[PDB]
């Protein structure tokens, strides 16, 4: 079975997150050039973006969150999720105590600035699933794009936004420095089931069906190269894992990157397998808050298939 495309292009709204790490880990350990592939990796502030890269052409598979599948669907779109990196959202939302030190409740996030990586991003839509729960709207506030990395933490820490939505390391360094207080976490299963119900898979790769369509082999070499990556996190010390990224990904802290990989261990997927209740979770996530969704149109199954992740697994049992 020979490659349909070896040269592949990969769009990433946030290449430094803990959120992506399978995906660094897949190209700093060759696991990409294992199955013959030459894959391109093109970074952007958040998921939003790098989900345009791909509708505009520039880019053939998107490393982004699992909910946008369906959110594509809902308007007549289809793409596939099929290789899993993240199985938690690892998502979380804080306060700037500098500007909301008297913070009480979601009331007082009403007419403020809330730091998510790209509009649009699962960044955005979080906080918008939170207003929608707690009885306000997503124009009650203003999101402010502020990317994945230094930006963001800067931005929090100078005064420019009021709240911030992001992953680990961001929200880490964040948290150690005193300048956040988190409203809503979602690193652990327990946390995210707690807010949405059942499995919430975040970070995947997925792409338009006429890819998943015209390069089946190409999708397998990829998503062993997820499931390869997937099961070295899961054995490697948080050493081994920092000493594999690029040094611009510790935020300048590496003892904080450490405790980072240790908080959101359990939100990365171990073996790249899709949980069977997740875009049912998804799905119904997404109708509590996005305005005239209509779920019933959607079939979750078009979203999603464990095809290649279940070959990977038994050619990569270790």
Known sequence: ?????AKVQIAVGGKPLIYYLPLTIAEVKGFFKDEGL?????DFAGGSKALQAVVGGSADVV???????????????????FALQGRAPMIGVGVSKKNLPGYKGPA???????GVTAPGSSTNMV??????????????????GVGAGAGAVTALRSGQI????????????????????I???????????????????????????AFVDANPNTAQALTNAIVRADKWIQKAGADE?????????????????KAAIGKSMEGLSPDGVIPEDGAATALKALAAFVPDFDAAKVDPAKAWTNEYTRRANEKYPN
């Open 1 to 5: 079975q020979k490659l349909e495309k």
């Open 38 to 42: 030459d894959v391109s990796i093109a």
């Open 63 to 81: 490393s982004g969150a699992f909910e946008h599948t369906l959110s594509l669907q809902a308007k007549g779109q289809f793409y596939r999720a």
């Open 108 to 114: 007082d996030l009403k007419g403020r600035k809330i």
């Open 127 to 144: 906080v918008n699933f939170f207003l929608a729960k707690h009885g306000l709207k997503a124009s009650d506030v203003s999101f402010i």
């Open 162 to 181: 009021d709240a911030i939505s992001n992953t680990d390391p961001v929200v880490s360094m964040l948290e150690t420095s005193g300048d956040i207080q």
């Open 183 to 209: 409203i809503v976490d979602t690193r652990t299963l327990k946390d995210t089931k707690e807010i949405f119900g059942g499995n919430m898979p975040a970070g995947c790769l997925y792409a338009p069906q």
């Open 241 to 257: 894992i920092a000493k594999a990224v690029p040094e611009g990904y510790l935020l300048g802290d590496p003892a904080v990157y």
